[PDB]
Amino acid sequence: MEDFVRQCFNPMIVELAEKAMKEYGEDPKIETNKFAAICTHLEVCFMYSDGGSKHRFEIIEGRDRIMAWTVVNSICNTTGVEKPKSLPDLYDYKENRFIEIGVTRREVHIYYLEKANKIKSEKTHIHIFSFTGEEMATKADYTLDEESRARIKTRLFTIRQEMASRSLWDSFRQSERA
Ligand SMILES: O=C(NCCc1ccccc1)c1nc([C@@H]2CCCN2C(=O)c2c(Cl)cccc2Cl)[nH]c(=O)c1O
Ligand SMILES: [Mn+2]
Ligand SMILES: [Mn+2]
Ligand code: NA
Numbered sequence: 001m002e003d004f005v006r007q008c009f010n011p012m013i014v015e016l017a018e019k020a021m022k023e024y025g026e027d028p029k030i031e032t033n034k035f036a037a038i039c040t041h042l043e044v045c046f047m048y049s050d051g052g053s054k055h056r057f058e059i060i061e062g063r064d065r066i067m068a069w070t071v072v073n074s075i076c077n078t079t080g081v082e083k084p085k086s087l088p089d090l091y092d093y094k095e096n097r098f099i100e101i102g103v104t105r106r107e108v109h110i111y112y113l114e115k116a117n118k119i120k121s122e123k124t125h126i127h128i129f130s131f132t133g134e135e136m137a138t139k140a141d142y143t144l145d146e147e148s149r150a151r152i153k154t155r156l157f158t159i160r161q162e163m164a165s166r167s168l169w170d171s172f173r174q175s176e177r178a
Pocket of ligand 2: 061087088089
């Protein structure tokens with residue numbers, strides 16, 4: 001599974017994921033499912049931001065903390081939107097709202113509720129993907145067109161199939177905690 005991650009994901013994603021783990025004292029060579037999950041969430045955030053017109057989205061996830069908040073605080077100043085209590089994943093210039101992206105190994109509704117309680121910043125929009133093709137979004141508003149969302153869902157499915165072909169999927173699927 002460590003070799004799986006290093007083979008499956010772009011090196012920039014893998015480096016960001018290793019850093020995120022190390023900043024909390026975790027070893028990517030040991031907590032390997034966590035390693036994969038963080039890689040997956042990052043790649044989904046980058047694909048989402050490529051999903052619309054050029055310049056439609058601002059990426060917040062994947063930046064160091066100081067630059068992430070500089071982006072958020074900048075956007076709050078130029079558009080007047082409310083400042084979130086915690087770092088979101090993207091800003092949508094078209095809809096003028098922050099977006100929290102979730103990727104789940106359980107199912108989308110339990111995760112949606114959890115991030116609704118976890119974030120609770122009433123203004124941030126929540127969009128969840130599963131590995132089996134379900135999605136769930138705030139007020140049933142899915143932001144991107146069907147083509148873009150289809151591309152994300154197809155990519156998660158491929159990862160699932162690839163894990164299972166290597167016999168890693170069952171441990172990964174069971175490793176996500178409330
Ligand atoms: O922005 C995120 N994290 C910002 C920093 C942060 C760090 C801890 C708690 C809150 C926020 C973020 N995080 C997660 C999930 C759930 C919370 C932790 N986590 C991780 O991926 C994760 C990371 Cl980052 C580092 C080490 C281990 C893990 Cl398990 N899911 C998201 O969808 C997401 O957007
Ligand atoms: Mn995030
Ligand atoms: Mn997220
Ligand atoms: Na979060």
